[PDB]
């Protein structure tokens, strides 16, 4: 009915706000990115610090794992993305082309492509092996807050401060669908690729039927008017929605009933990022400048 997430570890080491935490697909690691220009790798089950990955010239807003857990991609204010070998920490490629801060990034399931979104209002699609920009999409009219592939890679969902969520055909880069118009600050596909979870800067999360173009669920009670906060589907136990919040809490909702089932207290600044572990009932949360830590929380369900 309800989870019982409790704090198990606090991970200190970034020296500015943490922007994004992500678990590796194989469950072994947590990657964190920060405004301190660094990526840090931590053991997912014990919080053990593994390594620092460095090379960006300005802060990082997002980090993402390849399907096989062997590569990372980071999005920076230095207008580049970087592809990293996680084992060696080496920068394999630098993706140049955006003309402003790169804010969000993701591999496709094949992990032959990276998608990125930027303050320059475009979405770019990149070749992992060569590092070349395959396609530039004039996707929005304000900064692009989030980009995500669906489970077979055939679609990209993007969101923007312009108020729009759009679905793009990966192969052709053409728009398939556009969904008050408050800024859309986060979006991602559900695991089954049937739904899209969208955050808007009016303190609201919404679950959309992609094909139907209709809103099925709305989740409220948290605070989100200012920052691009990540939101998640939690599927390892009970089916929850998880999000950070500008009141410094992690919120967990029952996906079906929309009821808040837990609020996790401990952070001392905006909880900008949360992530759900692929096999265990473990949440990672991270906060901005007044906090700068990552917390690992574990539940029985």
């Amino acid at each position: 009915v309800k989870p019982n997430y409790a704090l198990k570890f606090t991970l200190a080491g970034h020296t500015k706000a943490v922007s994004s935490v992500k678990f590796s697909p194989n469950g072994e690691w947590l990657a964190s990115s920060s405004a301190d220009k660094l990526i840090k790798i931590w053991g997912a089950y014990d919080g053990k610090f593994e390594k620092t990955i460095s090379g960006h010239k300005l802060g990082i807003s997002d980090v993402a794992w390849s399907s096989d857990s062997n590569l990372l991609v980071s999005a920076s204010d230095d207008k580049t993305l970087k592809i990293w070998d996680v084992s060696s920490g080496k920068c394999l490629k630098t993706l140049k082309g955006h003309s402003n801060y790169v804010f969000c990034c993701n591999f496709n399931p094949q992990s032959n492509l990276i998608v990125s979104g930027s303050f320059d209002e475009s979405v770019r699609i990149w070749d992992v092996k060569t590092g070349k920009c395959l396609k530039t999409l004039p996707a929005h009219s304000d900064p692009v807050s989030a980009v995500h592939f669906n489970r077979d890679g055939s679609l990209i969902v993007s969101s923007s401060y312009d108020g729009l969520c759009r679905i793009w055909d990966t192969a052709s880069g053409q728009c398939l669908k556009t969904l008050d118009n408050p800024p859309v600050s986060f979006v991602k596909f559900s695991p089954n690729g049937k739904y899209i979870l969208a955050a808007t800067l009016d303190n609201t999360l919404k679950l959309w039927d992609y094909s139907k173009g209709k809103c099925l669920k709305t989740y409220t009670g948290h605070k989100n008017e200012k920052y691009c906060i990540f939101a998640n589907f939690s599927v390892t136990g009970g089916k929850w929605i998880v999000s950070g919040s500008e009141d410094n809490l992690v919120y967990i909702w029952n996906l079906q009933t929309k009821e808040i089932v837990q609020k996790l207290q401990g952070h001392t600044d905006v909880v900008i990022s949360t992530a759900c572990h692929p096999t265990e009932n473990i949440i990672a949360s991270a906060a901005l400048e007044n906090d700068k830590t990552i917390k690992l929380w574990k539940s029985d369900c």
């Binding site: 807003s61 204010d77 400048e289």
Partner: peptide, 7 residues
């Protein structure tokens, strides 16, 4: 720039 409130 995800750490900043954009206005």
């Amino acid at each position: 720039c995800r750490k900043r409130n954009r206005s």
